[model samples]
Target: ALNPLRHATEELFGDFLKMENITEICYNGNKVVWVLKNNGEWQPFDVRDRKAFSLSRLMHFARCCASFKKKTIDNYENPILSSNLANGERVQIVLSPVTVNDETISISIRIPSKTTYPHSFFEEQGFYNLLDNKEQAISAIKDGIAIGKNVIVCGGTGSGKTTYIKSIMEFIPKEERIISIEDTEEIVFKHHKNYTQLFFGGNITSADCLKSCLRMRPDRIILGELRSSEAYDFYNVLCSGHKGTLTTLHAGSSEEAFIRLANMSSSNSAARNIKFESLIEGFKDLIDMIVHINHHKQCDEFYIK
Candidate 1:
């Protein structure tokens, strides 16, 4: 397994990488690799050689270790690596200990580049319809961006949170500077200048990125997905003349969004000592919109306060 990635070739994966509909590829220690398409179906991927196949999995694990600036994934308690694929797609490799799930690592590679759904794609998927006419929903979103409002899109995993956020981000004026913080580098903005992307992991978490961006002169900030106490830092961003912050988190509704932030904020070590009421006020007072997009790819629930 020496420089396994450096030696990987198409011999390991015949035409598997060429498929257009494929979204995820998982290696579950079996002889065959599993791929998940946008259709939500799984099938064994095409392979050419056995040794090459095993090496490909090790290379993927190597990439995971590289993301953490470590050598190996064997001893880590819970190893999760997030990096880009050869095609510039986002790839995440997770190594769950034998005590948790299985005796081998489970790999998940998300091919964002392959399915680069256009902003127009959501239009066909009913992003415009929120409870009223599409125009009103869009107008409200535009007005919020214009007035520097903090917005959080919440939903379950694999929902349309990122898609809807990218769609809403299109309304932002081109003149504004955007600083995006991500855990796994998935958020990609359309052709807009003055854009900055910061990554978070191990020692460099989202809270660290937020603290650094304070003096970086960002007109608007985007947290690709908020899962940690980094929620606490964004409230300060709002007060620091950096408004119109955008992010997504997991939840079922607006009330749940706030509650999730409250719990995650306390959980993050940097924000653990934060006052409870201030945290509550920060989320409620600064956040102007909480939009939920269901897994069905529709913006069915919208809440703005």
Candidate 2:
């Protein structure tokens, strides 16, 4: 019989996965393996032997072809580790073995892509019409900018929050300075001279970056996600006579989003002395509108509100 591990590696990092088009792949344990293709289609990826899919095998395949071999991943333990290829393409993973039973590991792969869907993606899905029942999206943007209202985009996972936010940014005045900060480089922030991108992790933090961004003289501060104690600093920034801030968070409803924001601020502030209610009221005061997204139930694309 063929070596199961070698077969799996060849299948994943071989000629097929060597392409620049592959966006994401997942190994959900057992006979379940799949890849997200170029056009956003899900197709089965045979990892070869279903029964032989052990934790070590998956880990080996994940870390294969890595440069320097320094960020050693524990095939026995789960951590958010990354594997690098010779072509500079990186495969980031979060592996967990605890809940999936003996020798089973859960893995998620994120493949980089420069692809953006066509403009029809929003018009066909009613994304542009979500804000106003009677007017075009441009009118809404005009009004929003006229009022200089800060927008908070909220949604569950895969709710197209990023796409929606980027599309709306198209209407922003080119003269205004915009800075977007994130933990990872999710939003490209490309095609605009007024936009600046900042990232946080490792040594630096989101709170530190936000404080630094203020000195960059930005007219608008775009925070990709408030992951840490940065929530406290963010609330202070909103109250500091600054405007045109845009941010996103994971929440099922707009109502719960405020509470979650409060809780995150409180969690980060657990080390400090602060009233939790202050966080909720701070978020409520600065947020002019909450744009929520959900996977459309009636249509094939996303729905917005």
Candidate 3:
């Protein structure tokens, strides 16, 4: 029931700090620890016998601690932060909790600074292909005549879902009001001065944000992804005459996307009486087009319905 890795990682982290001449160290996650050098005086800290920190221990620290600097560092292998250098860049180490208890953990290290790159950072990084050619893809979506139809982008995790959504959003006229809702802010629309970004958190739910977007008289309403009863609200908005809407969902194909929407639509209390067949029919009717982004990073492909 004890995690030995956490202890070892903490000790390793402390020693790393000393080796790097880091007089002050600040880190947050499963365990919060900070050390400061007193008036430039260096003292060697030893933690050689501690166990290596595991992902579970790291997640426990992140979830339990309100803030990292507020906690005291002790010898109990309670979650602590570590650092490393990779590719000549300073990398902060943290354990990412996954459903499986495998030895592999999600390690996130911050980039030293922002670099100038295309909006398709993931694509350039070999995450996935946006299209055979970026220009052609942009032109197809941009010059299309369907300006007032509800569009859905569907794909699974690691798929180019967000990238496709963002690319399509660039085609909208700069003068129109564009409102977007997301759990995390990932959409980039810097050229559009008339855009509003809303995040669902603390006091706001996706439905609440959708409802508020309706009041704003948006020309386009973009929901980051539809995964819950919030799809019902989005459906209602589409049928109510607000068009040029777009969103994404996790699905294998266009047909499966319709199925996902149908299931999500019926989840609403008001739509409880709706049958599965009827829900599917409504989704088919409301969504004018569906674009499927591929998950394979090495091969470029997209399906339009």
Name the best candidate (by lDDT): 1
**Candidate 3, superposed: residue stretches over 4 Å from native:** 1-62, 65-140, 298-305
lDDT of 1 by residue, 1-305 (tens): 32444334244443566676665676765556887765556888544356655644565544543533543454365476655444445555565554245545555666552234666777676676666767776677878877778888888765657766876777788888899887555667775789898887657878888888776888888888887667767666766666688889989888888878877778766675678776777788778888887756567677887
The top-ranked prediction according to TM-score is: 1
Superior by lDDT: candidate 1 or candidate 3: 1
Q: Please report, as a residue range, the 10-residue window in candidate 3 with the lowest summed lDDT.
A: 107-116
Model 2 CA lDDT for position 235: 75
Q: What's the TM-score of every candidate structure?
A: 0.77, 0.74, 0.61
Candidates in order have lDDT scores of 0.68, 0.63, 0.58
Ten-residue stretch with the least lDDT total in model 2: 296-305
- lDDT (Cα, tens digit) per residue for candidate 3, span 196-258: 998785467899999999898888888988988898898788778875888888887778888
**Model 2 C-alpha lDDT per residue in residues 1-305, reported as the tens digit of each score:** 12443465555546446555556667666566777664456777675664345566566665553322345555465345665443334455555544355545555565643455433466666664544442444355446854567777777544556656666665567777889887656665544587678877557889878989999999888888765578778777888988677888877666777888877787675426767677787788777767666644111212122
Worst 10 residues of 1 by lDDT: 1-10
lDDT of 3: 0.58
